[PDB]
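Obj: model holo form, ligand = flavin-adenine dinucleotide.
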Amino acid sequence: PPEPLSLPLDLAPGLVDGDTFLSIMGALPTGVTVVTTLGPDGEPYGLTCSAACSVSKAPPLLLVCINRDSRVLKALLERGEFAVNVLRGGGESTSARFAAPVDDRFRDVRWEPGSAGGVPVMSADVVAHAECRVAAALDAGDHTIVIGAVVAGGPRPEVPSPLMYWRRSYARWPV
Amino acid sequence: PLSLPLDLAPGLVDGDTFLSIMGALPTGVTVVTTLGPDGEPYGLTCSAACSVSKAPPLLLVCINRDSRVLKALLERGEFAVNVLRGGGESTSARFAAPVDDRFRDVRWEPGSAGGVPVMSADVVAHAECRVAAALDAGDHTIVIGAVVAGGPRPEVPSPLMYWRRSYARW
Ligand SMILES: Cc1cc2nc3c(=O)[nH]c(=O)nc-3n(C[C@H](O)[C@H](O)[C@H](O)COP(=O)(O)OP(=O)(O)OC[C@H]3O[C@@H](n4cnc5c(N)ncnc54)[C@H](O)[C@@H]3O)c2cc1C
Ligand SMILES: Cc1cc2nc3c(=O)[nH]c(=O)nc-3n(C[C@H](O)[C@H](O)[C@H](O)COP(=O)(O)OP(=O)(O)OC[C@H]3O[C@@H](n4cnc5c(N)ncnc54)[C@H](O)[C@@H]3O)c2cc1C
Ligand SMILES: Cc1cc2nc3c(=O)[nH]c(=O)nc-3n(C[C@H](O)[C@H](O)[C@H](O)COP(=O)(O)OP(=O)(O)OC[C@H]3O[C@@H](n4cnc5c(N)ncnc54)[C@H](O)[C@@H]3O)c2cc1C
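Output (holo structure tokens):
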């Protein structure tokens, strides 16, 4: 379970307060994903993650930013593969469930192993899922940036709304 | 821009599959801005933007490697992230449009951080950032911004969002 290398950063004095930083970042609305993987054992691990975006089309890359300590991150880097489950409009308590300080997060959660090393796919709770080979990981401040090469996954056009978060409220597509 | 070696699996999905998956992730809409060498304002529409770190306070943006806005941003070593609001549809289109002079008919003002263009109208908030690092990741450059200035507008009742080829408010 090795530590990724810290990214060399030029940090000027005169950076904002943590409170100013959240007031600024909390103005940017986001999706809600559950990043999943398989322990060395084969137990399903996951955490609620909002810091996800596409990086590259050719080759097909995305990134997630996870806290350095995360057990899911540790399992994810050991395994070398993870899934990004983009939560649907009804999945506000799936969000809270994968953010909760508990050991068995997948207790009474519907999931299937994916094509790529059996990473957990939450078919019932998602608008889409990506299955990724870990292409790179770098420590950047109090988070690790993980870059994933998309090996499999697909959209669910049958699901008409995503989960969205802005200024301490969840929302959905108006259907 | 740092060169980053990728442990790629032969077996990567094709471009259109990738877009169908990423298109299902709902995204805020921002205009990344900077000043050119002798102070021409540059800007592009950017949805690949997220919070990275509380302390130090970092955000990142992903931009095409061949971007002239990126080339100028890296030259000046600072940029702004303007988070567009509900009414900002046409501003998003303009800074996406493959045209010159994107700031023509746009209300902007130089920021406290190097005069990086802060957009007056059609924004819920702006961050001003020093370039802390930049990484080549396939066909994009990941720019890590250390937040030195900016603030929200609580009065602004909705940000711009984009999902499955539609804009919405919120
Ligand atoms: C969208 C979202 C993202 C979150 N990301 C993290 C996280 O990366 N690590 C973590 O430990 N807890 C995270 N949390 C939980 C968070 O720490 C607490 O809910 C926080 O105390 C609430 O502060 P706030 O209302 O100002 O921020 P929120 O309403 O939670 O969101 C403010 C913004 O802070 C950004 N952010 C970046 N790094 C952090 C960080 N270390 N802590 C909090 N917000 C951060 C997020 O992108 C978010 O958009 C997140 C919560 C939400 C809703
Ligand atoms: C939100 C959004 C983001 C875009 N990002 C880029 C970009 O970073 N670079 C670029 O050259 N063109 C980008 N474009 C332009 C786009 O690639 C073209 O318009 C193309 O025709 C795709 O349209 P589409 O309807 O198939 O998918 P869209 O609805 O245009 O895109 C679906 C999703 O795929 C991702 N995406 C799209 N294009 C790229 C890309 N080239 N690299 C990485 N992720 C991408 C984004 O997450 C987007 O939300 C973007 C367009 C939109 C609407
Ligand atoms: C909602 C949304 C989100 C997006 N998110 C992203 C994203 O996250 N990342 C991303 O990379 N893209 C993203 N895109 C796509 C991006 O905004 C467009 O591809 C944009 O046109 C790129 O601008 P650029 O300056 O980087 O392009 P460039 O190709 O560098 O230049 C843009 C235009 O400038 C002019 N020009 C070029 N060279 C010169 C010159 N020497 N002198 C004068 N004029 C010149 C030309 O007309 C050229 O077409 C997004 C688009 C949308 C709609």
